[PDB]
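Ticket opened by: R.M.
Priority: normal
Category: complex prediction / small molecule

The reporter submitted a protein together with iron/sulfur cluster and asked that the result be attached to this ticket for the collaborator who will pick it up next week. Submitted input follows.
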Amino acid sequence: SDEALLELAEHIALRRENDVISTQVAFGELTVNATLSGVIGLIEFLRNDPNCRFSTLIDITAVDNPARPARFDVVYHLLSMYQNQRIRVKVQVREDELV
Amino acid sequence: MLNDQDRIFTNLYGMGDRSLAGAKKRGHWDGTAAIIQRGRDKIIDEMKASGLRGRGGAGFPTGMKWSFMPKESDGRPSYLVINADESEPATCKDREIMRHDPHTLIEGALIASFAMGAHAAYIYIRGEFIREREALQAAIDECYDAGLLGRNAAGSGWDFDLYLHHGAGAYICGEETALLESLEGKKGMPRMKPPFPAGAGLYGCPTTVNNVESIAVVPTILRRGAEWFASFGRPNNAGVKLFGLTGHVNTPCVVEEAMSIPMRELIEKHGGGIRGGWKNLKAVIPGGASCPVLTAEQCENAIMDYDGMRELRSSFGTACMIVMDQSTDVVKAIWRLSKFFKHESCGQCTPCREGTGWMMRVMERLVRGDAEVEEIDMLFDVTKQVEGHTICALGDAAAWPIQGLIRNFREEIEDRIKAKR
Amino acid sequence: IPAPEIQTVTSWKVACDGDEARGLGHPRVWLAIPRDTGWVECGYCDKRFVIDREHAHDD
Amino acid sequence: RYPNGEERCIACKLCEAVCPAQAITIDAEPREDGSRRTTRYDIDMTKCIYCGFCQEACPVDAIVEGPNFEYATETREELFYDKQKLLANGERWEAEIARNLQLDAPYR
Amino acid sequence: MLRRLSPIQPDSFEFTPANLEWARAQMTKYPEGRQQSAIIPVLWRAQEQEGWLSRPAIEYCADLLGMPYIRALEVATFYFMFQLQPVGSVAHIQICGTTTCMICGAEDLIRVCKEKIAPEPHALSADGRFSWEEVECLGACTNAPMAQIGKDFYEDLTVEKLAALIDRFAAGEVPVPGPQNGRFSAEALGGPTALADLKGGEAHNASVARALRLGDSIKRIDGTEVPITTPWLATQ
Amino acid sequence: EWHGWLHHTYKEPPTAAPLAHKPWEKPHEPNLTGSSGAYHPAGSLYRAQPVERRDYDAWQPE
Amino acid sequence: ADLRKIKIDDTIIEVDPNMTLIQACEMAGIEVPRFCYHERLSIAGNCRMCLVEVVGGPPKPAASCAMQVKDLRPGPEGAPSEIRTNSPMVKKAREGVMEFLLINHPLDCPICDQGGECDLQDQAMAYGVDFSRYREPKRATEDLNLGPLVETHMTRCISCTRCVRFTTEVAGITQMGQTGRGEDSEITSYLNQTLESNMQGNIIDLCPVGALVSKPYAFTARPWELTKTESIDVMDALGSSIRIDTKGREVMRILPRNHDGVNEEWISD
Amino acid sequence: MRVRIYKPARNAMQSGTARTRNWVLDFPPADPRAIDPLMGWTSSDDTQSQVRLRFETRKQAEDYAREHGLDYEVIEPHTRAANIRPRGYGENFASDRRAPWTH
Ligand SMILES: Cc1cc2nc3c(=O)[nH]c(=O)nc-3n(C[C@H](O)[C@H](O)[C@H](O)COP(=O)(O)O)c2cc1C
Ligand code: SF4
Ligand code: SF4
Ligand code: SF4
Ligand code: SF4
Ligand code: SF4
Ligand code: FES
Ligand code: FES
Ligand SMILES: [Ca+2]
Ligand code: NA
Ligand SMILES: [Zn+2]
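Result attached by the on-call engineer:
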């Protein structure tokens, strides 16, 4: 599943180059850092794309990082029951910025 | 074999005349001025060629050690300290040199001191050797009267003073840096290196520490010659060596022999053989307490020299042996050494202050068989935690005897556990 | 305050654990009786150990 | 208390540190005889979650959760237990508490 | 074993005039400002004079050499030849217990000591005249089993011979030290196996010969027994 | 004495297997909540002598 | 000013050659366990907890507190000398020394004032094994009479001699020493007299274990309860940098904090 | 209110330096605490003192206080400079030492 998640991350980085800032696979989980302006387009691609069929939204939450210029992270957790895989999407948000 | 003509210590037993005149009859103090006028470099270069190696326990090339000393004085005086502590449990060779053939030690001190550019030498003798110190002090006073020591020592044109200093019962004070601490009026705790003694030793001045037998041999090598000394023994194991035969031999004694003599020939020739015949031999500790024990079979072809004992996974040490026959409890023998090392650790550094006691108390239970068999491997592991992790080599010396027992007599330890359980 | 318990011992080193079976006391500690005063007290249970000087056996 | 009648608590404060609800408050001084003992030992029973972490953390089995569960009160402040109240509970329930400790000792 | 000073201490210490003279000579063997080097020899002489090392002696010798008291106390407790409490008034028997003497019967010798002197080491006999202790190797292992009494080694011992020796000390005699089995010094029993021709040159070995001449084996040294000489002061 | 048996914690009744008691133990009391013997904190207004609290000593004029 | 390059683990760093390896490691932000070494005391080298591996040297681990950078043999061709603080040898050395430190240490943490801010607890957690192999009786030690400021529990002493080195070098008194030999060697004051120094309270900080503790502070708090305020002392005109530890409304103790230009890291009694 | 921006100093009781890397923005207690009469607990109406923020650099702490209109004081830290011993361990045995080293 580690090789599988790295392969899947390349597929996303390739098809959504401008949405994706970077990807990471740590502790067996794939995290995608995305731009705020492209997060909706990317999550839509993840939902509908054949290789990555992330049609279950597990949840959305935020993390506060006061030491950072963009203090908030908004985190999207998505599950695919058909592909049997998970993904996390993270976007950095400034205070008073709209998501 | 060695014959009287080739024996350096010719009055080792003190049977002959012990006066200064009697020593001169035996060739000592003979042309000391001429040797010194050969210069520092020629003497050092000759000691290097003779192949002499430290007789204190580690066997480091002596001439090389002398060449670490500075050639010019930078304001700090140089010192030679002669190590007469001799508290290693099986070692008694140095006792004879100091009380019966002192003039070999005194002259070697002068020549060695000149070779390092030292005007003063200090002999550190163990405090238990009360009569040896009185006898050695009497010889030093004879030499001062004869002019062999003092303003123009032996007519050589070198101002040399020889002092006698004694300890008060610490085996760790034989360690070279602990000796300097004891000589300065402190409790004898070793120093870490660096600084090295050639850089900062006694009083923070350049110092060389040599064993009594290392120095006492110097004048004869220079008089007879480096090639003669290197004739005896195997290559890289040169010279004649004072041996101690102790334990369960017919006639225990101290004797001078060539290096690399077979162990059996040494025992049979001078020890009178094993008590009850060679087949009664059980184990031998070949070079003092800190040397791993040897089985009866390993001693068959053992060659008494630095390479021979290393090849058998043991150490040459001081070359004084403990011979144990088939009636000896070997686990009890090694245990009593663990008790010795626990008694002697200076307590400065953790792995030996705490480790030696732990090793002793596990060994005591192994003597009685009051242990699990898994504690033998545990004990071996504990010794490895001490060895190499301490300030001074006493930590190592406390681990090797136990490691030798486990490597060579493990079945005897496992029998005691089965015998009791 | 008087001690809750006194034991007389013939050794200068004692161990106390609250005298309770199989892990029901306090952590086991070793205490040294000074030769000057001849008694020591457990820091956990306050038990006092008192040396029997005439029979006190050095180890 | 110990079988010798002395308090088991030595004011280590491990129970106060582990308490998830911060229900324990302790103050200690050296006693007149020099012993390490508490002068205040409060449990706020309206903060406590009855998790038993304190008895797990105690190194001397001083604080325990006992078998009693029928102590409903008519006023809230009757549930602010001070040191003497807790010690009185231990002196009345010791026989059952000690037996329970023996029964569960093989699993602790 | 904890190294502590005895709880009962003499009120004062003072070197005898000849021992104070001897001590000052010892300080001249070491460079200027290094007189603290003489602490061990000077402390040893204090014990020799009195038979044990007392607190006033340690403080007296610290003042003589300009050391702090704690520094001098460290020396006294680190070096185990110093007796920090009274020992037997007549003699103190030190029996080697290390391996070579152990496998040659040292433990049987210790059994003799417990029967004749005292059940435990460092304990005075009922008279107050004898004490014993077990010590590590004394560097006479070819003469094992052996013991030290006073200044002298008594070597090649046996339970019978050691018992007899203690009886002579108890009667006020000083038996001859050295090998008790007829050996000379350290050569093989039954004649040297090397340097055999020299036999006859000297009656006794160096240790025994000096002991017989001076008779100070168990004598409190007052400093008037050996002349005080400093030949090194001429060298400059 | 009987609580453990009545709640099935112990198999045998205290008649057959009596509980060991230490000499410093105290007799059982029921719940005293609605009575005058109810426990109250030292600073309670029920106490009628509530313990006064402070953490510093004040200087007193001469 | 001829800085020398050295490679520590995987960090190449340039340091004064007179630095010891332990000082260089801290400059590189690499943690090295220690008990006996202190920045402002003479190097002792007795705890053996700071042992590191010098790549290419003899198999013996080296005490990083005592080895100057210039003592390291230069690397081949002039490459920077390498030392490892992460190798299996170092891991085994640290585990071995920690085991030796604990075999005779008393099971005192609940009643010991050091608990919660103890270097022995913390480095045992980080650098030791989680179990014991020691099955023998432990050493028990008598306590000292050092006066009304320092309470002693000498069974806890790990023989680091920080107290001796501070009182002798910094406080300038000669009352403390280490008598005896071996595992029976005791840290002590001469004649069991109370220490005479208005700088003696500093040994409470310096002692890494609860052997030397504060009598006035004894048993009153645990380190995790305290609110810490960095302030300035007014008991004299030096203006020492201090830390005030409060619990609720009350100050519970006063500790020094470092100021190289005023009080270093000491305060008076 | 007024906040403190400072780098917490090493605990003198310990030699570790891991709790000395971060900057903190603190809201120091604003009014006196009181003693609860009933149980003697420490009472407070100052919940703002519960807040303790953590930063990696002084700039980050100073920025946050500025973006949030907080009056702040920055206390500068006192780093301990390395005590470089020219002779290292060897100074313990220097010939010119005032007194012998005690080990
Ligand atoms: C614990 C210990 C004890 C030692 N005892 C002695 C000794 O008694 N006599 C001796 O000559 N060397 C002894 N040594 C060896 C010295 O440290 C040093 O290596 C030697 O004296 C140098 O002299 P050499 O090279 O001429 O042999 C001892 C070493 C250690 C670690
Ligand atoms: S290894 Fe033993 S004798 Fe050597 S310094 Fe360490 S504690 Fe002292
Ligand atoms: S049982 Fe109650 S007092 Fe004990 S730790 Fe849990 S919440 Fe705290
Ligand atoms: S009850 Fe136990 S854990 Fe709590 S302070 Fe007392 S001894 Fe420590
Ligand atoms: S010094 Fe540290 S490890 Fe030792 S008992 Fe105290 S808190 Fe525990
Ligand atoms: S008392 Fe403390 S500072 Fe002194 S040597 Fe022992 S552990 Fe080190
Ligand atoms: S073993 Fe006894 S004198 Fe050497
Ligand atoms: S810190 Fe280096 S040996 Fe102690
Ligand atoms: Ca009490
Ligand atoms: Na401390
Ligand atoms: Zn107890």
